[PDB]
Every structure is written in structure tokens, then in C-alpha cells.
Design a protein around this ligand. Sequence first.
Ligand SMILES: CC(C)CCC[C@@H](C)[C@H]1CC[C@H]2[C@@H]3CC=C4C[C@@H](OC(=O)CCC(=O)O)CC[C@]4(C)[C@H]3CC[C@]12C
Ligand SMILES: CC(C)CCC[C@@H](C)[C@H]1CC[C@H]2[C@@H]3CC=C4C[C@@H](OC(=O)CCC(=O)O)CC[C@]4(C)[C@H]3CC[C@]12C
Ligand SMILES: CCCCCCCCCC(=O)N(CCO)C[C@@H](O)[C@@H](O)[C@@H](O)[C@@H](O)CO
Ligand SMILES: CCCCCCCCCC(=O)N(CCO)C[C@@H](O)[C@@H](O)[C@@H](O)[C@@H](O)CO
Ligand SMILES: CCCCCCCCCC(=O)N(CCO)C[C@@H](O)[C@@H](O)[C@@H](O)[C@@H](O)CO
Ligand SMILES: C[C@H](CCc1ccc(O)cc1)NCCc1ccc(O)c(O)c1
Length: 286
Amino acid sequence: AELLSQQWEAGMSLLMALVVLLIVAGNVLVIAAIGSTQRLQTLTNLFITSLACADLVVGLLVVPFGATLVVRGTWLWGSFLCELWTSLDVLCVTASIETLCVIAIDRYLAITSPFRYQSLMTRARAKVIICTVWAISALVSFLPIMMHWWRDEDPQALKCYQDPGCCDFVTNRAYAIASSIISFYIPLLIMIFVALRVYREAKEQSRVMLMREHKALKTLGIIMGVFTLCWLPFFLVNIVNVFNRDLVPDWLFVAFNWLGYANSAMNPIIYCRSPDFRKAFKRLLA
Ligand SMILES: CC(C)CCC[C@@H](C)[C@H]1CC[C@H]2[C@@H]3CC=C4C[C@@H](OC(=O)CCC(=O)O)CC[C@]4(C)[C@H]3CC[C@]12C
Ligand SMILES: CC(C)CCC[C@@H](C)[C@H]1CC[C@H]2[C@@H]3CC=C4C[C@@H](OC(=O)CCC(=O)O)CC[C@]4(C)[C@H]3CC[C@]12C
Ligand SMILES: CCCCCCCCCC(=O)N(CCO)C[C@@H](O)[C@@H](O)[C@@H](O)[C@@H](O)CO
Ligand SMILES: CCCCCCCCCC(=O)N(CCO)C[C@@H](O)[C@@H](O)[C@@H](O)[C@@H](O)CO
Ligand SMILES: CCCCCCCCCC(=O)N(CCO)C[C@@H](O)[C@@H](O)[C@@H](O)[C@@H](O)CO
Ligand SMILES: C[C@H](CCc1ccc(O)cc1)NCCc1ccc(O)c(O)c1
């Protein structure tokens, strides 16, 4: 009874810490490698840095908080932080998918108008792009949450809000469909459409130099593919609940949200496809 709980609590704590460590180490490495290697200070890598910040915030704030909820079986932190924590979860996935769109659009430009790209894209503009992405993402994630537009009047929902250790994100149907479409489905569709155009236009192409560029693009394709595979299951289930709560078991819905968090750990590994990152990683770790 109490022993079963102790064994579970301690092993789950150990796993959670590992996940945190992997997400924080991996993404600090990416930021530090870029911050300190002129060869890696390209404009595309400024977008990568932004993605790494999104993932780092998941490692430092989103996951640690969720971990305490999984390990201890209740929300220990009060009402405000529960809402802030929710806000930050929506924020990061929103900022991630929006950044991935930008990366795909940056690459489409560079490949179809290399010279028009040359005269448009500067460090100053890349900064504006990044900031705009985080602005829109903040707008779409915080306000509806601070305006309580997500709340329901279901008996289930009143139960949770009248229980100080409840921090499920029980939402009304309108918000579920709206936030999913606005945070995820639309940027998803744009990203896929643009990523396929980048695929067609890369096909209409020293041989050594073009191979190295296609290796790099494939790496970006992989980042986008893995991100879709990590989050699409959660968002699909999010929709399905609006229509039928029985069609898909609870435990798998929760797990899918954790699969989403897990994506924040994957990008640094995936970047080891690149000689340059690999070398910068090995050098940084001394
Ligand atoms: C806890 C949450 C709610 C706050 C989120 C933090 C943001 C304000 C961060 C996330 C991404 C960050 C940006 C990521 C990348 C850049 C590029 C950077 O350009 C550089 O010259 C340094 C790049 C390098 O490492 O070589 C300037 C800061 C800026 C705009 C950062 C400004 C602050 C941003 C928007
Ligand atoms: C909220 C959901 C429903 C829509 C998300 C779509 C976004 C993922 C993408 C699609 C096109 C992107 C935009 C394409 C071009 C620009 C111009 C870009 O660069 C500048 O404006 C620099 C101009 C300057 O200051 O000189 C600013 C960001 C922005 C609006 C991008 C922000 C992110 C956008 C809106
Ligand atoms: C959750 C976070 C949400 C991000 C918040 C975005 C706010 C807008 C970002 C911003 O302030 N700038 C966009 C930058 O692209 C302008 C800055 O550059 C600012 O420092 C200016 O006053 C200077 O340009 C003048 O020296
Ligand atoms: C970007 C996302 C922004 C989404 C904004 C959604 C706001 C819609 C708010 C809303 O529709 N409700 C109040 C929430 O403040 C009420 C209902 O959703 C629900 O609570 C009850 O009417 C039930 O009886 C079911 O119909
Ligand atoms: C309240 C009920 C919540 C219970 C669910 C908690 C599951 C613990 C989350 C976790 O860390 N993992 C399970 C994920 O569900 C393992 C991850 O490390 C793994 O997903 C990824 O590292 C791989 O997919 C990468 O290839
Ligand atoms: C904070 C909340 C619950 C996360 C959670 C719930 C239970 C757990 O045991 C562990 C984690 N996750 C929100 C996911 C989400 C993300 C984006 C959206 O647009 C949306 O409607 C919902």
C-alpha cells in the first residue's frame, strides 16, 4: 500500500529528473554552440535558437511543474500558478509550430529567390520575425486563459475548480476547438504546404555543395516531422473529446500530452546529423 506508493514516487521522480536534465542540457548545448561558433551564426540558426528557447522553457517550467503533479497526485501550488502553468504550456507549443513555419518559409525563399532573399533577410529582420512570433503566441495563449474563456459550467468542471489541488485543464468545447485550430491546425497546414513546396523545388536541382545543403534541409524536415508526430496525436484526441469522451481512453490522452513535452528533448539529438554541431558539442563539453 504505502510501500507501493514509495516505490512509484521515487522511480517516477528519477525519470522526471532525467527528462528535465535531457531537455535542459540538450537545449543549452544548442544555444551555447550557436552563441559561440561564427560558422553557426547564420540566420536560419537564429530561428533554431528561438525554437530551443521554447523547448528550454518546457524543461525549466512546464515539465518540472507537471512532474510534481504526476509524482504527488495533486496540485501543490495554488490557483494563480496553475493558470500560469497552463498558459506557459499553450505558449510553448504555439511558439514552436509558428517558428517551424517561419523556418520553412525562410528556406522556401532562399531556394526560389536566392538573390531577393539576399537583399531582404538581415539579422535585424530575423529578430523582428522572432519577436512577432512570440508576440502572436503570447496573445493567443495568455489572454483567453486570463479571461477565463476556457472554463466550463459542467458538474465535472465545477468539481475541479472547487478543489484547490485540481489543475486538470478542463475546458469548454468552444475553447478546445478554437485553441486547437488557432494554436496548432492552421500553422500545421501552412508548414506542411510550404515544406512540400520546398521539397518540389529542391528536387528541380560542386555536387558536393548541393549534397551538403540537402543534408541540412532533410534535418529540418526531420525536426518538423518528429514535431508533428509528437503533437498531432494529442490534438487529434483533443478534437475527438468534444464529440465523444468514450471513443479514446483517458490514460492515452494524458500520455499524448506527455509525448508532446518529450519533443523538447529530441531536437538537440537530431542536430547531431550535422558535423558542425557535433564538433561544437564535443568542444563545449570539454
Ligand atoms: C517565460 C516566457 C513567458 C518568456 C519567453 C522569453 C522570450 C522573451 C524569448 C524567447 C525567444 C527569445 C529570442 C531568441 C532569439 C533572439 C535572437 C538574438 O540575436 C542575437 O544577436 C544573439 C544570437 C546568437 O546566439 O548568436 C537577440 C535576442 C532574441 C530576439 C531573443 C529575445 C527574447 C525571446 C523572444
Ligand atoms: C495565429 C495563427 C492562426 C497564424 C500563424 C501563421 C504564422 C505561423 C506565420 C505565417 C506567415 C508568418 C509571417 C510572415 C512574415 C512576417 C514579416 C516579418 O518580418 C518583418 O515584418 C520585418 C519588417 C521590418 O521591420 O523591416 C514579421 C513576422 C511575419 C508577420 C511572420 C509572422 C508569422 C506568420 C504570421
Ligand atoms: C512572451 C514574450 C512576448 C514577446 C513580447 C514582444 C513585444 C515586442 C518586442 C519588442 O519590444 N521589439 C521587437 C523587436 O523585434 C522592439 C525591441 O527591439 C525594443 O527593445 C525597441 O525599443 C528597440 O528597437 C529600441 O532600441
Ligand atoms: C483562442 C481561443 C479563444 C476561445 C474563446 C472562447 C470563448 C467562448 C466562451 C463560451 O462559449 N463560454 C464561456 C466561457 O467563458 C460558454 C460555453 O462554452 C459553456 O461554458 C456553456 O455555455 C455550456 O452550457 C456549453 O454550451
Ligand atoms: C497523470 C498521468 C500521467 C502519466 C504519464 C507519465 C509518463 C512519463 C513521461 C516520460 O518521460 N516518458 C513516457 C512518455 O509517455 C518517456 C519519454 O522519455 C519518451 O516519451 C521519449 O523520451 C521518447 O519518445 C523519445 O524517443
Ligand atoms: C496544462 C494542460 C494539462 C497537462 C497535463 C495534465 C495532466 C497531467 O498528468 C500532466 C500534464 N495541457 C494543455 C495542453 C493544450 C495545449 C494546447 C492547446 O491548444 C490546448 O487546448 C491544450
